[PDB]
Amino acid sequence: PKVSVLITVTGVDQPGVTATLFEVLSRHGVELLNVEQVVIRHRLTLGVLVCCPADVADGPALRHDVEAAIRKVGLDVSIERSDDVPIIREPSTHTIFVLGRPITAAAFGAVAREVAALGVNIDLIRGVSDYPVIGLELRVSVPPGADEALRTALNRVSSEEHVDVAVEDYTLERRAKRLIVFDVDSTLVQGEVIEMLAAKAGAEGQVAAITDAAMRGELDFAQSLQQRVATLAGLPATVIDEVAGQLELMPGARTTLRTLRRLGYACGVVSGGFRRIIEPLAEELMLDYVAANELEIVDGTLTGRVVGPIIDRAGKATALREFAQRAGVPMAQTVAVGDGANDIDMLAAAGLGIAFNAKPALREVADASLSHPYLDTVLFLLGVTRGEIEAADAID
Template structure:
């Protein structure tokens, strides 16, 4: 059964030889010989700085020991990798949900708003602790939003114009939608930014926090309910139920402590450039490649030479 067979997917973002030599070293250390090794197709625009392979592992491989060996070696070269059951890698997923801040975009929008409000450092420090799981998300969110009181709402448009979208988002969502996978943003950030990404990339639905505005300025008050970790988990489950999708056929991608509930509930949780507390609890990670690198964990990239 494929549930008992494993595949190791490795994505190199520097010297192909250096990264894959580390994989070979980890396998040799455990006296493991891959049954098959295949190169995966890489977009032409990335061919000079990305390469990928999938290793078919023999039955009975010690996944925990191999994981520990790879983690010890990965500091030597930029490389993303994941050990998955073959069934997980080739599964026909039907729903994918994404965190927004520091996942789909390379910033925290509440920090950007705070910078305009003159409280950037104060809010950024609270955000960092919340994303690391050191503070209660709801309490810290209320505290941060209160510091935005009086900010001119027009700054939202300025932030939207310069919002740094993560590399690979367009390719990822286009491919998921082409596969018939329903996509949603579940964000602890704010609706205008999530809706902007929805318009740009075609997400099917978005869930985020509202910005309360009165006479053109932010009131500093929070609109309920707050989209926190539990809200994200419940929304993932609700969308799956509504669309008659088994949770095993769902994907969740995120980076912070408030993403952990949905990452551990979905059939496949991917920690993207995640905080240490998340990396310790989510096995499938992506830390170097663009967000489209998630596709390699879904069996994408037709094998070269096949």
């Protein structure tokens, strides 16, 4: 068939419009090049690009047949010769996630302004969650080289408007993420284990102060780890098991891991904490990888030292690389989630580095930042919706 014709149906949605249009078109000599339909809040748009002989596209039959059928039932239709029109839309370059509790119109409005200000076309908006936070995705087409300035502008909007805003690559490769690592303390697990260990020694305040210093990036991780573990010298080793029994997962942690298993992620933890605590939990959560430090014990008592090599800032990244290589996963398809300056090198080496309720030092260099205390918001950044999570959980 020589020429192209475009038919556009819009109006209040009704059952059977789709079948009716194509059945009408089948009386004329029509082959399909592209069909796009959606219904949003009971508004239908059905756009159909077809080719037929110049013969049929130029004679009044096709028009009257389509116009009559669509208008009888109360919808509107347009028909027009195309020829230079695109057959099929381009893929979006990027996708932007906005999470908030609440998301004000002012905040979403500020996101749309920076987007427009940078020449970025909004291709599609949809909802990705109503719980535990309101979540919205904008798929976008970003002019080459603008993607740095876009994150920068949307990071300012994020801090000024009290929403999380993550800009990510939406190409085929970059978005088949297949491996994830979590930091443990204040990421996967609530609070700081080394503080729970220090309270047994009557030293919580000293250890808490040094931990907060080190997590904000003010102190060398290794020196800080040694001063803090030193505080535990003389505790009986039974303390490890007691503190392991007290640990609470971050809210949403179980849904996060269970959803990531459904997706076939390899799953791991990289910690500056202690293996005898973390393994207990990592076996329970069926994780595929653990890197941790190790407490020194003599005669069933903690010496206050660790048994090197110390997992430090560089060490976390080294651990992720080791895991990615054992698993067969290129670094571009890896994800890392952490809260502390401890995590900066790991987050930067990962394909996507997510700062979870993080100190400013990590937040400043992270690909994306999450501010709400629900570890499952990570799933929204991995392209999963709340409805998808709930359906899959309800099957069992």
